[PDB]
């Protein structure tokens, strides 16, 4: 565990993280994909051996000894708001189980279903709150990765409001 488990946010490519493991915003078929998934494929391609897993689940594959946790958020183009919300909460619960099983002291995590899978909605708060629900009972240092300057501000404010 971390000595004083924390949440932080950084605005940069998750493929350059300084944590003991990474969460990929995966597709269910283990394909290279686009966005976070493509950056993860270029950095850790060995981790996409048998990485396919259903929506709402997480599957870990090692790249050397570095764990890549493939977490499959729902595509809100295809799911109802209700079913999508349930699957997005479930993907994060499975990430917390994997982070715990691996025994890491830190994890780099993107906001699931906030990009191409958002169904053209702003899901910062919805996705971040499901991340907190899952990860609050873990003792890993969590570092959230984003790319947008105003998202960095909003994520940082949400973290600091609980401290
Ligand atoms: Cl960067
Ligand atoms: Cl996404
Ligand atoms: Cl972002």
Curated annotation (Swiss-Prot):
<protein>
    <recommendedName>
        <fullName>Non-structural protein 3</fullName>
    </recommendedName>
</protein>
<comment type="subunit">
    <text>Interacts with mRNA-capping enzyme nsP1. Interacts (via C-terminus) with host G3BP1; this interaction inhibits the formation of host stress granules on viral mRNAs and the nsp3-G3BP1 complexes bind viral RNAs and probably orchestrate the assembly of viral replication complexes. Interacts (via C-terminus) with host G3BP2; this interaction inhibits the formation of host stress granules on viral mRNAs and the nsp3-G3BP2 complexes bind viral RNAs and probably orchestrate the assembly of viral replication complexes. Interacts (via C-terminus) with host NAP1L1.</text>
</comment>
<feature type="binding site">
    <location>
        <position position="27"/>
    </location>
    <ligand>
        <name>ADP-D-ribose</name>
    </ligand>
</feature>
<feature type="binding site">
    <location>
        <position position="35"/>
    </location>
    <ligand>
        <name>ADP-D-ribose</name>
    </ligand>
</feature>
<comment type="function">
    <text>Seems to be essential for minus-strand RNAs and subgenomic 26S mRNAs synthesis. Displays mono-ADP-ribosylhydrolase activity. ADP-ribosylation is a post-translational modification that controls various processes of the host cell and the virus probably needs to revert it for optimal viral replication. Binds proteins of G3BP family and sequesters them into the viral RNA replication complexes thereby inhibiting the formation of host stress granules on viral mRNAs.</text>
</comment>
<feature type="binding site">
    <location>
        <position position="117"/>
    </location>
    <ligand>
        <name>ADP-D-ribose</name>
    </ligand>
</feature>
<feature type="domain" description="Macro">
    <location>
        <begin position="4"/>
        <end position="163"/>
    </location>
</feature>
<feature type="binding site">
    <location>
        <position position="13"/>
    </location>
    <ligand>
        <name>ADP-D-ribose</name>
    </ligand>
</feature>
<feature type="binding site">
    <location>
        <position position="115"/>
    </location>
    <ligand>
        <name>ADP-D-ribose</name>
    </ligand>
</feature>
<feature type="binding site">
    <location>
        <position position="116"/>
    </location>
    <ligand>
        <name>ADP-D-ribose</name>
    </ligand>
</feature>
């Amino acid at each position: 565990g971390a000595m004083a488990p924390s949440y932080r946010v950084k605005r940069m490519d998750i493929a350059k993280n300084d944590e003991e493991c990474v969460v990929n915003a995966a597709n269910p078929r283990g394909l290279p994909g686009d966005g976070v998934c493509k950056a993860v494929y270029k950095k850790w391609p060995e981790s996409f051996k048998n990485s396919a897993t259903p929506v709402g689940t997480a599957k870990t594959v090692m790249c050397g000894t570095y764990p890549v946790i493939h977490a499959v958020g729902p595509n809100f183009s295809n799911y109802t708001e209700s079913e999508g919300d349930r699957e997005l909460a479930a993907a994060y619960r499975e990430v917390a189980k994997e982070v715990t099983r691996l025994g890491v002291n830190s994890v780099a995590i993107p906001l699931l279903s906030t990009g191409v899978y958002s169904g053209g909605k702003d899901r910062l708060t919805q996705s971040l709150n499901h991340l907190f629900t899952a990860m609050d009972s873990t003792d890993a240092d969590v570092v959230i990765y984003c790319r947008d300057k105003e998202w960095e501000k909003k994520i940082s404010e949400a973290i600091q409001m609980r401290t």
